[PDB]
Structure 1
Amino acid sequence: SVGLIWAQSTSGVIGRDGGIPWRLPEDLAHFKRLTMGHTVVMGRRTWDSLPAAHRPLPGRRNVVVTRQTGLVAHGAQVVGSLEQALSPAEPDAATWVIGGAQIYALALPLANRCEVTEVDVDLPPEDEDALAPVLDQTWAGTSGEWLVSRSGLRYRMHSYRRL
């Protein structure tokens, strides 16, 4: 099982200026609950984007997809392709692809699940933004209710499975 997991604004922005252009603690807790104890696969730019306290993501096997020989920042297992990231895999569990946009594009043809957090923040896309992948007719989804963050932002979760 290969799952994509991401958070996006309603406009579809996932990344800006090498980070995430909102703060939503409830999404971080959701992300930890779904990924804890599993392999997480990410692109190298996302790896370098992690604050030092969160790199590597604790309690998870951190796999970084890169064309380089290796990385200056410690804690990852490097691979040269998504296929190398995905095999071998954890039994009875999902391998989670955790971004960014380039790695989501590579993984989308292979995924069987997407777990999306939608954040109701008004962020008109800017020229260099990373955007969420668009799901085609092979996906069926369900959506949770709108929730209110302690910070006041509305947010909700959507879950998609491959038909």
Structure 2
Amino acid sequence: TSVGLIWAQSTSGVIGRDGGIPWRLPEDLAHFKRLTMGHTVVMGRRTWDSLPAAHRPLPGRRNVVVTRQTGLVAHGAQVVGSLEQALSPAETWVIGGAQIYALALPLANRCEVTEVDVDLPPEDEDALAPVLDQTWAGTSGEWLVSRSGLRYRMHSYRRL
């Protein structure tokens, strides 16, 4: 019933580039697994096809893919034709990408953001993070240092 968006972004707001994610941050993958394990995860079809083969479907989670197609070549998803169909019938996580974040933003009650301090000026075809309006209240964790050297931190928003 509760609908959460979860994403990682560069400070500049990039979430996706060239059909993938333009940084590596192991600590964020662990965070993403902890928050989503045992829950339904909803994603757009491009994100489904973007998963490396070892990670598709996401293990231990019910994988729901939003698409206008009849069905998919890549196995392991339950396909739906709309976000509403994905959401009904306690925690449903929308895990990307930009198109599916835009669809889910009006419905969500939580956002869990990882900010990665990697210098990625936006390029012409990048997917960008959604912008949160005045209906959201947020708290931010401290800056952390990855074993890879990148700084990162988590922001958590709840609908007012």
1:97-133 superposed Cα distances (whole Å, 9 cap, x missing partner): 0000000000000000000000000000000000000
Inter-partner Cα distance in structure 1 for 2:150 and 2:20 = 18
Q: Give the counterpart of 2:156 among 153, 156, 159.
A: 159
Matched length? 159
Structure 2 gaps of 5+ residues are none
Give 1:89 deviation, angstroms. 6.0
1:43-92 superposed Cα distances (whole Å, 9 cap, x missing partner): 000000000000000000000000000000000000000000000066xx
Is residue 2:25 matched to residue 1:29?
no
Inter-partner Cα distance in structure 2 for 1:88 and 1:73 = 24
Inter-partner Cα distance in structure 2 for 1:136 and 1:157 = 18
SS class of match (1:18): coil
1:1-150 equivalent positions in 2, closer than 5 A: 1-88=2-89, 95-150=92-147
SS class of match (1:103): helix
Inter-partner Cα distance in structure 1 for 2:33 and 2:89 = 22
SS class of match (2:102): helix
- Taking only the aligned residue pairs, the percentage that are identical comes to 100
Inter-partner Cα distance in structure 1 for 2:90 and 2:159 = 19
Inter-partner Cα distance in structure 2 for 1:151 and 1:52 = 24
Inter-partner Cα distance in structure 2 for 1:68 and 1:25 = 33
Give 1:32 deviation, angstroms. 0.1
Structure 1 gaps of 5+ residues are none
Give TM-score, length-normalised by structure 2: 0.99
Inter-partner Cα distance in structure 2 for 1:136 and 1:96 = 20
Compared with structure 1, are the counterparts of its residues 78 and 89 closer, same or farther at alpha carbon in structure 2 (3 Å cutoff)?
A: farther
> Once superposed, what is the RMSD of the aligned Cα atoms?
0.7
**Deviation beyond 2 Å, 4+ runs, structure 1:** none
Give TM-score, length-normalised by structure 1: 0.97
Compared with structure 1, are the counterparts of its residues 127 and 110 closer, same or farther at alpha carbon in structure 2 (3 Å cutoff)?
A: same
Compared with structure 1, are the counterparts of its residues 13 and 65 closer, same or farther at alpha carbon in structure 2 (3 Å cutoff)?
A: same
Give 1:40 deviation, angstroms. 0.1
Give 1:5 deviation, angstroms. 0.1
